[PDB]
Design a protein around this nucleic acid. Structure first.
Lengths: 149, 129, 144
RNA sequence: UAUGUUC
RNA sequence: AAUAGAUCCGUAACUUCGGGAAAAGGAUUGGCUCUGAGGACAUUAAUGUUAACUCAGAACUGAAACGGACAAGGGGA
RNA sequence: AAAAACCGUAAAUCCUAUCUUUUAAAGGAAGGAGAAGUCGUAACAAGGUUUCCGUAGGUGAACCUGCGGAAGGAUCAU
RNA sequence: AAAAUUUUUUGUUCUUAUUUUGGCUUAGUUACGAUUAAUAGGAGUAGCUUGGGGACAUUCGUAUUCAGAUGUCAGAGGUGAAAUUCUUAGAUUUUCUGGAGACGAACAACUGCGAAAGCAUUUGUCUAAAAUACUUCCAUUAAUCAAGAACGAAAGUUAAGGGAGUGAAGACGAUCAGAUACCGUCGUAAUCUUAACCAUAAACUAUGCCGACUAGGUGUUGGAUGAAGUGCUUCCUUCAGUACCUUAUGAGAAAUCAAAGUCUUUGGGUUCUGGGGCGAGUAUUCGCGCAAGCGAGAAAGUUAAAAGAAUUGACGGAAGGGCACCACCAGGCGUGGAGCUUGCGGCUUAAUUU
RNA sequence: CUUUUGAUGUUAGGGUAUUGGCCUAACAUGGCUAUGACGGGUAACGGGGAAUUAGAGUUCGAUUCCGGAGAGGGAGCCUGAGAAAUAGCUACCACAUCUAAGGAAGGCAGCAGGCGCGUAAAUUACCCAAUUCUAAAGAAGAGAGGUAGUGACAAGAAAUAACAAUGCAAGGUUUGUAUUGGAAUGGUGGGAAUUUAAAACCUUCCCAGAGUAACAAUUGGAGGGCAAGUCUGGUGCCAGCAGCCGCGGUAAUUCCAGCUCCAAUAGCGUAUAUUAAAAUUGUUGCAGUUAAAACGCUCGUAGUUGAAUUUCAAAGAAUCAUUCUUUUUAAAAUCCGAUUUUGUUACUUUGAGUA
């Protein structure tokens, strides 16, 4: 774990079968359109995959079609300018700062906000080392509330 | 963070045949550990190991003969010339008559004796005796 | 791990650690601190000539009981007052009150030796005549 | 469950 | 009585960190002849008209003198 | 050729400032060593108020007391 | 669009064009072109999930204390014993009412949460965390870290408020040879809240963080899996915590340690710290601080030990047993209370021999 | 930190033998730095090398050779191919010589030598014979250099005897051992050959020339560490010894002496420094619960370290039962069924150049 203690090995393990499940006679001719419609209706790719697994019964979009969900979203041009995890971290930091402004006596909240901003800086450094984020992206803490956009 | 995979592999091997369990599971397989294991095999220190090739950087199960006194890695992988082979050997191995100091060389994984007989010493990997 | 950086590019860290840490032992600090030249009276010399000021008896340590016969020497090289032990049974009588005397260390560098407290030097010859040549036997000529 | 030094 | 204007340089102890401070302490300053910098306005990137005194630099010059009169801190422990 | 002037090279001297090293000193205040010195008994046993930490105040001295800690406690325990 | 080749107008000299190829645009064709998804990490989703995690507001509880009332009358407090103190103006005690501040018992645990310091009345809101489950997403984004930053018990400092109880200082009363202490009565600062400082603790599991491996059992906390006594309770497996017991042909100087193991068969990664004792965490200097002080931090000199663990003994205003008239007790008989002999001390001793 | 006083760069020039902020003018605001700039210290000339090393390391290197710098401290300059020269010049500072007082003259960190300083270091010698340099180049010079003197700095070889007979001890007529008594040989003196520039030394030969072979070995110890005395006198907690532990107050195995013994030996002690010992500086290779030592805790940059994955095998000759040697097997350009290149670096292998 990045901060604190606890190994917490809870996760999801993909099946050995890499290919599309045999019982799925469904055709991949419209699964990408389904995810595109879902993203248009407004869903982050994580919950797009979750909704696809639950309500559509088509696990491992990568197995159904040899291309992964955020990748097809980018290929269609729908993908957001800020990656999902970084945006969620920014939202958490914005909420925490909004709370702290009212309660400056919340030392624990201040500490965890420092931790969250450290994570934000590390992951933004990674994303701008890749070309997934503009080189001038900084995350100043003043206008992050509207930076979600 | 595992850092070195072969170090953990050899430490697990060592603990295993110190316990004398005759069969040991090495979880993070790699090509380097595979070649190290084949060299140990060809020198007769282990049996017929089989790599369980799952879709997830699979594992290895190796049969032990109760035959290895100690296998270990050398970290960092010091680059050794052909000249300092003797200096490393008299400091690492228990005798000049048995034991193997494993080098990675421009011509692959090999021990000190055949590295000498083929020239071109390289980087040190580990040892077993 | 091991407590030390073992990486193939950790030579800077290891070297700096050793450089800082060698100041922690008495030997290296004593041999490499610039203080020694000004602190010790011999200024790094093995021997020194001086002028006898007077003779004094110094108490031995508590377990023993003796009056070690030492002399107070004004070093001509610097002008420092030192105390030098006079070896031998009746060698104090062999030295007068205003003579040139050659003194050396007591064998433990700057440390006291035996039950004698605070004495770090010993007389080796007076009036350029050896105390050994005067005491153990009169094999050499007497006092000039 | 008063106090009670030193060699 | 001693300088004392201005420009450039330099400025300690101590300190309530704001000061001390013009600390202390140095150099220069005239005249003349020049050089450089700092604006505004019109024509189909380029060419003309025109204004303040303000700095900086260089030659030359003189009985080495120039805040030439006036005006104008003595400092320090 | 003497001699003179002006740029330049620039020794040397002096003033000022700063730094470095060494060094005197009324008085003050430590440390170490010595001797059978004086006063008490602080610690080691529950050391006779368990000991110790941080902090603060007080007292001839060791030390005492308050607050919060630790067991290295005198309790591994209805 | 240019290069190469050739032909060529035409009096020291002016055209040209032809054909192959290096570069731009325009349909088609390639096996056209993206490695896993780490018992790495981050993000997400879900649970009549968990928790004394945090902040703000709010609620309750007895106790204590103050004030008022109430009934009665000699004491009440306190101690080893007392005294200081309160008390016919009614102390203490009984009952009731109102106020105040602090605290949050019993439940309460070798239990929970938190990075640590720390966190325990109710309820609400805000906020975060962790584990678990996942065929959800990204795909190396990670580990440890000089400098640097946040937090950091108590005490202390500053300024307002609060001020019951306790109580550094102080004042008395005791004890004692003394007692400025331990004990008692009182009592200022402080303790509490708010806003700032301070940045230190035996801040301790005296044990840095990440990773791998190595053994059985008893529990316990939070999830998830499967099954069964009665829509409901237990058992099985497993993950993540958290202790304990045993065991080591493992370690260690040993005490002991499941890590303090896998180390002369010495190398997984990384940070910090130490180098005999005293001087000394002193002096000096610098940074920080309102101050107290904090962080960094010597030297001269001095010294043969200091230090750790364990064994035997001795000792204990340590515990548990047992014994004795050179101990006491069921009980008495004497000496020193009476005078006298004798030995020794001692007393002047030519010697009163020792 | 540097940057007015050139700091970093551009442009133009000046200057130089030449490049260059080397300098000048204008312009721009750069240059270096926790991978330690800028400072401070060095009892710091650097290297070839030296000591100690099992391997790592630690310490030293003024000093044969190479490079640098200096000629009391600075600065300036002439000649010259070459000097910012110093047994060349000019000036200042500090010293210091002669003077008739007007003025002159100097630079041993060259060779000797002297004073001073010190713990600390040699002859005011001989010669250009060798090595080599300079010249008008055989023939002259050279304190370069060589030779000798002083020289227990270091280093090497190596005397202080060897042998025969009884007596004695040990042993089945074998070893050691106080007396005799003849050989051998240096040390030494002299002559010579020789050597040498001359001389000296070595070597060689010839005369003498060893019995207490007086031709006489010392230094430091004898409680332990550590080889060797509970032997004899003196002293009596004094004197003294003792690196450390300790000894010394009447029986001192430790002091002062004698005898004997031990160690090394023409050498042996002492002092200081340094290396090993020291795995007590630990990369190899230390330790951190309690011996010294995990930051109170977390975040975090530099640094250090970082999961797996992309081209695998078969067949053939030779030692002994194995080991060892050789060929190919995708795709793109090369040669009309065959002809031949297919990321960078670290690292590693071979060379080159190594006084």
């Amino acid at each position: 774990r990045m901060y604190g203690k606890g190994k917490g090995i809870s996760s999801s393990t993909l099946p050995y079968k890499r290919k599309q499940p045999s019982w799925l006679k469904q055709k991949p001719s419209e699964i990408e359109d389904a995810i595109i419609k879902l993203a248009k209706k407004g869903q982050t790719p994580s919950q797009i995959g979750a909704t696809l697994r639950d309500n559509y019964g088509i696990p491992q979009v990568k197995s159904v079609t040899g291309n992964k969900i955020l990748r097809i979203l980018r290929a269609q041009g729908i993908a957001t300018t800020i990656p999902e995890d970084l945006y969620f971290l920014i939202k958490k930091a914005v909420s925490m700062r909004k709370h702290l402004e009212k309660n400056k006596k919340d030392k624990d909240c201040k500490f965890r906000l420092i931790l969250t901003e450290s994570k934000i800086h590390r992951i933004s450094r990674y994303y701008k080392r890749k070309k997934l984020l503009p080189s001038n992206w900084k995350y100043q803490s003043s206008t992050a509330s509207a930076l979600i956009a | 963070v595992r850092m070195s995979v072969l170090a953990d592999c050899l430490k697990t091997i060592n603990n295993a045949e110190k316990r004398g369990r005759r069969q040991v599971l090495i979880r993070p397989s790699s090509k380097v550990v595979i070649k190290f294991l084949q060299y140990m095999q060809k020198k007769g220190y282990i049996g017929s190991f089989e790599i369980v090739d799952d879709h997830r950087s699979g594992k290895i199960v190796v049969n032990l003969l109760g035959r290895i006194n100690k296998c270990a890695v050398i970290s960092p992988r010091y680059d050794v010339k052909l000249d300092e082979i003797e200096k490393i050997i008299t400091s690492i191995l228990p005798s000049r008559l048995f034991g193997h100091l494993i080098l990675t060389t421009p011509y692959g994984i090999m021990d000190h004796e055949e590295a000498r007989r083929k020239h071109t010493g390289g980087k040190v990997l580990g040892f077993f005796f | 791990g091991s407590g030390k950086p073992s990486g193939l590019r950790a030579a800077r860290k290891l070297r700096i650690r050793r450089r800082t840490q060698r100041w922690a032992d008495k030997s290296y600090k004593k041999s490499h601190l610039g203080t020694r030249w000004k602190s010790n009276p011999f200024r790094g010399s093995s021997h020194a000539k001086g002028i006898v000021v007077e003779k004094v008896a110094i108490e031995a340590k508590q377990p023993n009981s003796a009056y070690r016969k030492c002399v107070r020497v004004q070093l001509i090289k610097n002008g420092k007052k030192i105390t030098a032990f006079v070896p031998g049974d009746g060698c104090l009588n062999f030295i007068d009150e205003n003579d040139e005397v050659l003194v050396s260390g007591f064998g433990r560098s700057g440390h006291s030796v035996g039950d004698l407290p605070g004495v770090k030097f010993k007389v080796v010859k007076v009036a350029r005549v050896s105390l050994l040549a005067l005491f153990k036997e009169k094999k050499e000529k007497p006092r000039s």
